[PDB]
Design a protein around this ligand. Structure first.
Ligand SMILES: Cc1ccc(C(=O)Nc2ccc(CN3CCN(C)CC3)c(C(F)(F)F)c2)cc1C#Cc1cnc2cccnn12
Ligand SMILES: Cc1ccc(C(=O)Nc2ccc(CN3CCN(C)CC3)c(C(F)(F)F)c2)cc1C#Cc1cnc2cccnn12
Length: 301
């Protein structure tokens, strides 16, 4: 438990900005000097060590600082191939920083927007099996979060990151990266919520659980199979999305569901529909979602 040396973080560019600070892409100066029990980092000789750095504005309120430190504690526990990894912190003096691995292909929404489905769309291709592999990795990371008794609360392709060889890491940007403002609705005062990804019980009663994470996974998987080309419920206004949550509650058959993506087979679609069951206990666990995507869907190509 010692700070990473801030003087070794060499700025390259801004990855995001928000009310309370920024995210920077940095290079670690001569990273081999640091390798030890205290910092057992992975350096590849001949390859720069790139890292992402979340930084709190030095004039932040005391409550903002407590938020940042709480996030540090959470991140310090996360150790999984499909979750973003904490490499070090700077917290003994200001500005507070947290340092993670850098995912070189950006967020999953950006990534998939730039791809087309393997045979006018443009750019590099991505196959249907590769899309199942992207989704399986998200289910695997979420399964791990759930076993540690964490609820994500904002699962969407915008909070997933892409590294080498189609590797996905779940992340959560909170207010550090004010992209995608069009995905959040202002329900009260200064509070904005990702209503198009939220289970009806989240919207009506502010109840967030692994089962509402499963509901958001359904929507995220719909995004993946659509190659991020369309907003969920894009035919409906925000106020109509809220009304739709009310119809899940009323349960009289007026509720509407996201349509089957063209690249989605009927069984996978029926699994997505189960993610949107009215009753929490009827939604599939992430173990079952992962298995379906890694086995069933693959064996029936
Ligand atoms: C510097 C940095 C700091 C922090 C985080 C961050 O993701 N923190 C986080 C906090 C909590 C949770 C879990 N909880 C969620 C809430 N929940 C209520 C409790 C459970 C998780 C999660 F991944 F587990 F979800 C992540 C990401 C970055 C980044 C970066 C980066 C790296 N490559 C790139 C390339 C382009 C852009 N950015 N970027
Ligand atoms: C129509 C409608 C529109 C908007 C909102 C709304 O603003 N919901 C809201 C959800 C969550 C949060 C955030 N949370 C985080 C964690 N926390 C532990 C709970 C707070 C907030 C926030 F404002 F606090 F951000 C608001 C609610 C309704 C409703 C309803 C309702 C309730 N029972 C019934 C029965 C029949 C019909 N409707 N209905």
């Amino acid at each position: 438990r010692v700070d990473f040396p801030r003087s070794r973080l060499r700025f390259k560019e801004k990855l995001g900005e928000g009310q309370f600070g920024e995210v920077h892409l940095c290079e670690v100066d001569s990273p081999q000097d640091l390798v030890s029990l205290d910092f057992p980092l992975n350096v590849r000789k001949g390859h720069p060590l790139l890292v992402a750095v979340k930084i709190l504005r030095p004039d932040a309120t005391k409550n903002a600082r407590n938020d940042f430190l709480k996030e540090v504690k959470i991140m310090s526990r996360l150790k999984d191939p499909n979750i973003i990894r904490l490499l070090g912190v700077c917290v003994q003096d200001d500005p507070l920083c947290m340092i993670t691995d850098y995912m070189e292909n950006g967020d999953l929404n950006q990534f998939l927007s730039a791809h087309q489905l393997e045979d006018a769309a443009q750019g590099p291709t991505i196959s249907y099996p590769m899309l199942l592999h992207v989704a399986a990795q998200i289910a695997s990371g979420m399964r791990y979060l759930a076993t540690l008794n964490f609820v994500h609360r904002d699962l969407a392709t915008r909070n997933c990151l892409v590294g080498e060889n189609f590797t996905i890491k779940i992340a959560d940007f909170g207010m550090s990266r004010n992209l995608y403002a069009g995905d959040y609705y202002r329900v009260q005062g200064r509070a904005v919520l990702p209503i198009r990804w939220m289970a009806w019980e989240c919207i009506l009663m502010g109840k967030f659980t692994t089962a509402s994470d499963v509901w958001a996974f359904g929507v995220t998987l719909w995004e993946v199979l659509m190659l991020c080309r369309a907003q969920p419920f894009g035919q409906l206004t925000d106020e109509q999305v809220i009304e739709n949550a009310g119809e899940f509650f009323r349960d009289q058959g007026r509720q509407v569901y996201l349509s089957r993506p063209p690249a989605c087979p009927q069984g996978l679609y029926e699994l997505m529909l189960r993610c949107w069951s009215r009753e929490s206990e009827q939604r599939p666990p992430f173990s079952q979602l992962h298995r379906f995507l890694a086995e069933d869907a693959l064996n029936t190509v």
